[PDB]
């Protein structure tokens, strides 16, 4: 996969994880849309939850753990909050994934001008 | 390994040994009885084959020569025999391998108890002593001048009268 | 296939100097027996004697324990690669760990007097 | 008891005082050789032969099972490090030579492809976790009085 | 207990049956959260094979 | 293991006990190794871990199952190699609750 | 049923 | 003070014309009475310190040397309760008045302020020791050891005295808190070094490094239990607490008169430990052990810091109280055989079932398992070291290592083999001996428990 | 799980089971004292293993020194119940 | 093969330990010498569970930092034992 | 008291030992102790065990479990 693209076939497009951003956040976008949290800050402090853990996936996992302590012994109770939670994972890893094949096509692009 | 070697080996006993170590690292090598059977007879066959021969030449030259390859096609880790050194039981008892003479310094109230067997003790001991110094003289007698001796030790030429030396074998406590 | 080491020893078969036949060495393994034989029926007409109220002296470990302990000096002879490994031994090692120290706490003296060294929670020392 | 008869002494130069040594030390003298003098203590304590102690006979019934040493038996100048609990030169089917170069290779291998794959990792093929509040620039303590760079995140 | 020579003992049935009572027990376990959790191996999830994706989206200039 | 076999036939109890163990080990899908081990295999490819490290850890992965098989068959599935006389006894309550909580 | 060799232990 | 001296002066007459019968007992259970008026001192509701007169004085760095001396007192006379049971009456009777003129001496010193005084005392410890050691010893060179203590000690003793008079000069008087209030500091010449130390080498030189440990191990091993006791325990306490009680004035010299004193004391430290392991003698194999923690003492004392001072002060009062037990078990397997090696007996813990418990419990305190005292100052020794420089955990974990490793080699080369067959001289344990073991032992679980009695001047 | 321990009438049927089963020389008709070289016209390799056949049956290792001088069965039966020490 | 004079010792020293042996057997009457869980619940589970509240409950809650009860994780529209007012949701939760 | 059986049922018919001593008439040899090693390969101690024969253990009644919950459940929503 890209992997060996980068190492053994072409040697430079295959681009860098760690400076995304290098590109320009808007060049083909008109007027580009922004992102949304739908949890505040006051409500994921006091439900004392970790910075690994807080994303803009918070509701879906605030409404997961008022489901498992409430009725608690009868746990398995809350997998209709589990599925969406994973849900929400997946299209965050999507969005990520969507973000490395931008970048990937804007370099192909930079490169087709030369 | 209560007697003991000779200074020198023969050929004989250097040959068996080399045979039973291979083939214990037969058995260790191929698990199952059945091989260890089949390349068991084919090593008899080999021996077989140069037994009837006795020029120390090539008795030599073989003998060192199995030597090697038994020494570069040997077991790494071969089949140590429990009970034996290696194992996994060597001297595992040794902690509970007590000796006699921490007895004598019982105390009466617990001696009390197991009255029958200190009943019997005493005419133990009473078998050393008055036999002790008889058997010196079996040997200050027969310690022969010309001074070329092993480690063997003579019994009782007489009747009744008990051997030499049978403390530090007699009363050696069990295995468990 | 093989070769010796100071560790691993030749075992005993495979020794060349083994299966030799010669008269006059099978004649020291035997004076060899003979010896051993004597020491271990004088061991043995003493673990069994009887009316003894003591333990066994044994003169090797005494004597071991006297050449390492007290025969040293007097037979001691000083000579080169003895003085040198000994002033070596005694010199060297200090001095390297001494400018190992020195130079440490220059740097941090300097570095204090600089008024860098992050010294934040040092309250105890 | 002992006596300076029975106890060591100097280095011998001459069979005359070898032979009494050997009688006292209990051996034979064609066996009996000294250290060499480099004036070190060694003395006149027989030079043995470098060997472990989990070599000798373990079947015969030794007075010092735990040493595997007869009685007068002479005792190895060095066996504080061969009392069988400690070093032990039971030779190995496998050589010296050999088995350090099987372990130096393969631990050089190893660290070599270590480095390789730091060098050129692994990785998914995707860009990096996104966070909503500056990187959460309160949480990681930041300040109530600062406003750095507006880290923004866009819909794809 | 009296021991056998180079022969089969006569075995009793209740540590038989505990041997065949755990390993039922554990395939019994393994069936029920397999149907349960079949896609605990699997996942509900679709993994996109980029190619697939617009230019339309994610706007780029050509 | 090089002198035992047969251990099935001869002594259920154990064998059933340690063939659990050793596919729980292995990662059988649902024996709480899994529950673990297999989110680890997860992660280990799924972040940014060295290549080698990866490699070798699969390699494990799979060295696991080896040796554990090899258990199985040299004490579980081959003949009994070990000595004539015979005095088994698991029976016992002591050693047959154990294992079995 | 056997004898047990041991030290004393009333000590 | 004199609440603790003058009965200790009247044990003398008390031994003298007591009767055979019960010298013994009248004595010790009243030395026992002693260790236990002993303990007024500990009544330090406040920070002022305590003082009786211009000639006596307590402090918490001394008090407990004082408590541990008047403590060690009478298991110095039980310990030699089975030998010279066939020397004459007057002869043991002189025997328990030497152990008791040291005893008295010792207190003085740990108590007085001026360190003229404390010379003198440090001085006149020796008769009782070099006599204790010639006429009792079971060996021949006891006398070069003797000798060797006696002329170490001495010259240490003089340029202290040289320094301690143009001190007494320079200043106007010697005692103690007044050096204190008016010391000052020092133009740092070559005079003020060489007078640092004249001042310092003879503490040194009794509290061994590896330059001069040369005359412990004769010691500890020509000489008897009570005289390895005393020397393990004490003799050596005092160059550290007169070092502790004079460095106060020498500011700052201590900064650069230290480097080869502290790399001494390390290597030494980590060369004799090694030596621990190869050493035959077990007694020697002590000694050796005793070096190797007062040089972790000496590395403390120097660089002065607080927390290094009470490390020092733990680690004192540990080793002190672990070798005299550690002597008082060699000793006792001693007696059975009259042989100290250590390779004879081997084997034992079928017949010896619980002192291996207290052999146990001794190595376990050696190489500093918590919670002890012990590893409490070795801890705190290392971190005041490790500030002082960041290249000494190497040592302090080299040293740590090494004695991890032969204090096992100890247990195991006698408690942990297999019975030899012809030791049958092994009279089974004796209560008295247990009573020591015990005694020795118990104190270290109280202090472990409660140490803020045993921390220093800082604490 | 400690079985019981072993007496001569149990070693003797025993050794007469595997010396028996053995098949070379042995005309099925042993006496306890029927002398291996001497009697029955053996192999030193035929006792060797023998005698490792006895090991295997008894678990433990007889050693060499032993090995090459035990010549009969009664002595093979002596020489373990003097190593197990049985018949109390 | 064994010499005869060392069949004959063997032969003398097995007689001999066949006799320690039976000496070392003992007769009979040597040695000499001259609900239940409920029992342990109590003197096992209560009187420690006793001495133990005793500490806790009147010499370490009574001091200033000796248990800390890590804070409780609320949640959104969780109520509250004191006084604690209603507390807000969430805004839109799509899909 | 234990007891022994004879020393004659102890045969090779149709076992590997068979093969073998095949085999070693093949080569020109014997094979004494076959016999002796024979007390295995046969009795109660035959049949070629498997790993599925030692896996699937329970894996019948297993399976009836797994069908007796499932309908249970099914008449249990
Ligand atoms: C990251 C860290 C990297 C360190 C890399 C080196 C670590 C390995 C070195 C550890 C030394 C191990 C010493 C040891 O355990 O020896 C055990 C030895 C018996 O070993 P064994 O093979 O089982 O033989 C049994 C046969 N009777 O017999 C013994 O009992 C050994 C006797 C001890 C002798 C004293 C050793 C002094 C300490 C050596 C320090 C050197 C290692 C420094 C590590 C840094
Ligand atoms: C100078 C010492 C060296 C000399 C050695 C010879 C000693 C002989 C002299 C007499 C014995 C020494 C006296 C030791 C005193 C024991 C102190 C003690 O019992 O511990 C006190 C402890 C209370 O704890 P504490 O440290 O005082 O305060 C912290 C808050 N818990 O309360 C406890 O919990 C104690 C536990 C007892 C069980």
Known sequence: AHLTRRYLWDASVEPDPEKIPSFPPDLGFPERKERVMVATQQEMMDAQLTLQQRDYCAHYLIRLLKCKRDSFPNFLACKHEQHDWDYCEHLDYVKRMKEFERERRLLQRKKRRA | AFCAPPAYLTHQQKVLRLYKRALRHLESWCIHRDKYRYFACLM????????????????????????????????????????????????????????????????????????????????????????????????????????????????????????????????????? | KYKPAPLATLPSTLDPAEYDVSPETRRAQVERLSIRARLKREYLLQYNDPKRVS??????????????????????????????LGAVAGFGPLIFWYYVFKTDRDRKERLIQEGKLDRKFNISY | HMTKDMLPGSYPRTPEERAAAAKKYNMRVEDYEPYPDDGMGYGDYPMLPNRSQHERDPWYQWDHSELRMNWGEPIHWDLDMYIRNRVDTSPTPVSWDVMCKHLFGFVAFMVFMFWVGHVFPSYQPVGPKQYPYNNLYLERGGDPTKEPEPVVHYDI | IQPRYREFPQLTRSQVIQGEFLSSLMWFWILWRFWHDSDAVLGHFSYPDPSQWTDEELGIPP | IRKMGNITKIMPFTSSCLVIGSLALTGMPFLTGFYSK?????????????????????????????????????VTMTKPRFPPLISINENDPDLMNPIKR | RLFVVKPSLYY | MLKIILPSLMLLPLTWLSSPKKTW????????????????????????????????????????????????????????????????????????????????????????????????????????????????????????????????????????????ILIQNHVGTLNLMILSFTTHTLDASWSNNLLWLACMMAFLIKMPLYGVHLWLPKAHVEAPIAGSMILAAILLKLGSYGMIRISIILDPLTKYMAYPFILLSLWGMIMTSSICLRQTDLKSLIAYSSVSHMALVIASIMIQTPWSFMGATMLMIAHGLTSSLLFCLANSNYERIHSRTMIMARGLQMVFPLMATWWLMASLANLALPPSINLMGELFITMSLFSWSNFTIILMGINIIITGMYSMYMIITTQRGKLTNHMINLQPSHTRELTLMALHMIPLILLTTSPKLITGLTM | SDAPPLTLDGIKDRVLYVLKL??????????????????????????????????????????????????????????????????? | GYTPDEKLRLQQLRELRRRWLKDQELSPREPVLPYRSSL???????????????????????????????????????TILETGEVIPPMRDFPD | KMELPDYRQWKIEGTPLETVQKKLAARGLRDPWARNEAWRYMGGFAGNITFPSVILKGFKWGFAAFVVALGAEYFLD
């Open chain 2, 44 to 176: 008899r066959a080999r021996f077989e084959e140069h037994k009837n021969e006795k020029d120390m030449m090539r008795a030599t030259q073989l003998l060192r020569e199995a030597e090697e390859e038994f020494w570069q096609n040997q077991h790494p880790q071969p089949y140590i025999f429990p009970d034996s050194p290696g194992g996994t039981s060597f001297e595992r008892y040794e902690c509970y391998k007590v000796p006699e003479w921490c007895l004598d310094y019982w105390h009466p109230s617990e001696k009390a108890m197991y009255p029958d067997y200190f009943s019997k003790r005493e005419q133990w001991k009473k078998l050393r002593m008055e036999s002790w110094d008889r058997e010196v003289k079996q040997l200050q007698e027969e310690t022969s001048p010309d001074g070329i001796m092993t480690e063997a030790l003579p019994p009782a030429r007489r009747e009744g009268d008990l051997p030499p030396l049978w403390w530090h074998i007699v009363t050696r406590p069990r295995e468990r």
């Open chain 3, 55 to 84: 333990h066994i002296e044994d003169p090797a470990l005494i004597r071991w324990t006297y050449a390492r302990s007290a025969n040293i000096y007097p037979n001691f002879r000083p000579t080169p690669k003895n003085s040198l």
């Open chain 6, 38 to 74: 297999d989110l680890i295999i997860e992660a280990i490819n799924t972040c940014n871990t060295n290549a080698w490290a990866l490699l070798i850890t699969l390699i494990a992965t799979s060295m696991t199952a080896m040796y554990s098989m090899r258990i199985i068959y040299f």
């Open chain 8, 25 to 164: 007992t009248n004595v010790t259970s009243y030395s026992f009475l002693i260790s236990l008026t002993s303990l007024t001192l500990l009544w330090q509701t406040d920070e002022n310190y305590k003082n009786f007169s211009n000639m006596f004085s307590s402090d918490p760095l001394s008090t407990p040397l004082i408590i541990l001396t008047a403590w060690l007192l009478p298991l110095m006379l039980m310990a030699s309760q089975n030998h010279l049971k066939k020397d004459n009456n007057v002869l043991q009777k002189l025997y328990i008045s030497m152990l008791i003129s040291l005893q008295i001496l010792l207190i003085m010193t740990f108590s007085a302020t001026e360190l003229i005084m404390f010379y003198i005392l440090f001085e006149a410890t020796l008769i009782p020791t070099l006599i204790i050691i010639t006429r009792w010893g079971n060996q021949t060179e006891r006398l070069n050891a003797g000798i060797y203590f006696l002329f170490y000690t001495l010259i240490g003793s003089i340029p202290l005295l040289i320094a301690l």
């Open chain 9, 22 to 88: 053995y098949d070379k020389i042995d005309p099925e008709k042993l006496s306890v004292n029927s002398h291996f070289m001497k009697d029955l016209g053996l192999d030193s390799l035929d006792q060797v293993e023998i005698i490792m056949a006895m090991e295997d049956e008894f678990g433990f290792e007889i050693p060499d020194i032993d090995a090459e001088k035990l010549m009969c069965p009664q002595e093979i039966v002596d020489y373990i119940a003097d190593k197990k020490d049985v018949y109390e």
């Open chain 10, 40 to 78: 342990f619940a109590v003197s096992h589970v209560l009187i420690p569970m006793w001495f133990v509240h005793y500490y806790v409950k009147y010499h370490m809650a009574t001091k200033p930092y000796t248990i800390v009860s890590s804070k409780p994780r609320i949640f959104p529209g969780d």
